[PDB]
Each structure stands twice: as C-alpha cells, then as structure tokens.
Design a protein around this ligand. Structure first.
Ligand SMILES: [Ca+2]
Length: 274
C-alpha cells in the first residue's frame, strides 16, 4: 500500500516517528519549481510564486513536487512517506518551469520565507556564482532563526577546489551531499571544504507530478532529507535555536571519510533527535 523510500530508515527518521515526532506545527518552505498541490500524498498549506506567468501550486517540471514529498509525503496508506509528514508545508515558486530561476526570484522567496515565519527553508537549487543580496537574506533569515539547508551541487570534483554551489557555499547555509543506500557517496555529489553533511540523493523515489511517484537522483534529493530531519527535531525540542538544531545534525552524524568528500557524514536523526 504505502512504500518507504530506502532513505527514511537510512537516516533513522522512522525511529523518531515511532516516538511520535513528525514535525506537527513545523513550517517548511520548499523553494523550488512548485508543488502539485492536488497530489493525493501532499498537503501544501500556502505559499508564493516570484516566477512570472507561473502561479505556484502547479509543477511544470516535477522537481518541486518530488522534493516536497521527501519532506512531507503524508503518512497514510498509499504512495510514499515523507520525513516530517505532519509539517506545515509552504511552496515558494522560485524556478520557472524549464527549471532555472534568477537571483531576484530566489532572494525574494527567501525574504518571503523569513517574513512569514517559515521554521525551515529548503533550497535544492544552486549556481556556481553568488550575489551580494543572496548572502544577505540567507544570513538574515538565519540570524532571524530559520534553518537554511541547500543542495551542494551535482558537480563531482574539480581538482581539489570546491565544487559546491551557491547558496550552499554561504556558511549560514548547510551544504548537503548525497549518499546512497550502502551509504556510499553519490558520484555526482559535490566536494569542497564547505560540505556540511550527507543525505540520500541516489535513486530516491518520491511524489512526481500528476498523482504518481518517481525516481530521481541528486543532491537536490539529499537536501530535503536534511530539511525534514530538522522539523522532526524541531517537533521534539521546539525551544532549540537554528544553530542549536544545526550543531546536532552536524556534530552527532555518521563518519564516512574525509570532510572534503563527506562533510561530517551521514545524518542520524535519532541521535540528533535527543
Ligand atoms: Ca503517503
């Protein structure tokens, strides 16, 4: 009836669930291509779009809907199952259907998130170039107490230079790399000094636009696992601070090898939990 993507158990998300922490009352913003709000396995409570012509609540390129579901695919009897399935899910359309977005849109979405008390902002996007304004709203939202997790980049290596994109590069931002089920670091996952931690990003099955489910690969998929794991935690210790929450994801994870390639390693939600 319901399937459990090999990733919820991998990060021991499901052991937190058992205890009864699933992110109830936790507000997660997914800054993506949008979310098919009519998807039987998802319940989007609100949002916004800064993409022109595109309304939001509709997904032209299956990504937003896929990332959305990893975070909150409802806990029912069908489809899949998200990380923090009780969570208040807001979709911020920041990628115009062909998958790309301009900073103006990104920074706006970020701002929106902060201005609407979003406890979590998931950015499964990037660029190899930054901007002054992005660094400010990522720093600003975090100083504001939001937890900002962003995908690392789907660059592999680039010598021994950082292949981590933006905004993941902003140390106010948690850069998430991708592993698989044998906790092996995905091939395409980005390396750099900024990598923070790893999450499942290979062959991750989730909600796909028009009430169906599919398997995609990427850091883009790695990032949301981290965005839910914090909601869970935020649902157990609702007093904690962003940094309070980060440290725990950080300094309490599973060692896979060098920081360059794996960061602090694979997240452990249970241990981080408390
Ligand atoms: Ca479900």
């Amino acid at each position: 009836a319901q399937t459990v993507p090999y990733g919820i158990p991998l990060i021991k998300a499901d052991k937190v669930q058992a205890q009864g922490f699933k992110g109830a009352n936790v507000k997660v913003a997914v800054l993506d291509t949008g979310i098919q709000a009519s998807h039987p396995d998802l319940n989007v409570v609100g949002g916004a779009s800064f993409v022109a012509g595109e309304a939001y609540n509709t997904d032209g390129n299956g990504h937003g809907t896929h990332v959305a579901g990893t975070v909150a695919a409802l806990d029912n009897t069908t489809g899949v199952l998200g990380v923090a399935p009780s969570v208040s899910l807001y979709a911020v359309k920041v990628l115009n259907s062909s998958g790309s977005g301009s900073y103006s849109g990104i920074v706006s979405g970020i701002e929106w998130a902060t201005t609407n008390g979003m406890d979590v902002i998931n950015m499964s996007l990037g660029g190899a170039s930054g901007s002054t304004a992005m660094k400010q709203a990522v720093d600003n939202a975090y100083a504001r107490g939001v937890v900002v997790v962003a995908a690392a980049g789907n660059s592999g290596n680039s010598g021994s230079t950082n292949t981590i994109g933006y905004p993941a590069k902003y140390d106010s931002v948690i850069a998430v790399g991708a592993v698989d089920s044998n906790s092996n670091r995905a091939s395409f996952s980005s390396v750099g000094a900024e990598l923070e931690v790893m999450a499942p990003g290979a062959g991750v099955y989730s909600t796909y636009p028009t009430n169906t489910y599919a398997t995609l690969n990427g850091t883009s998929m790695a990032s949301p696992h981290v965005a839910g794991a914090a909601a869970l935690i935020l649902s157990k210790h609702p007093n904690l601070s962003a940094s309070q929450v980060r440290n725990r994801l950080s300094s309490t994870a599973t060692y896979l090898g060098s920081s360059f390639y794996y960061g602090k390693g694979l997240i452990n939600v249970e241990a981080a939990a408390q």
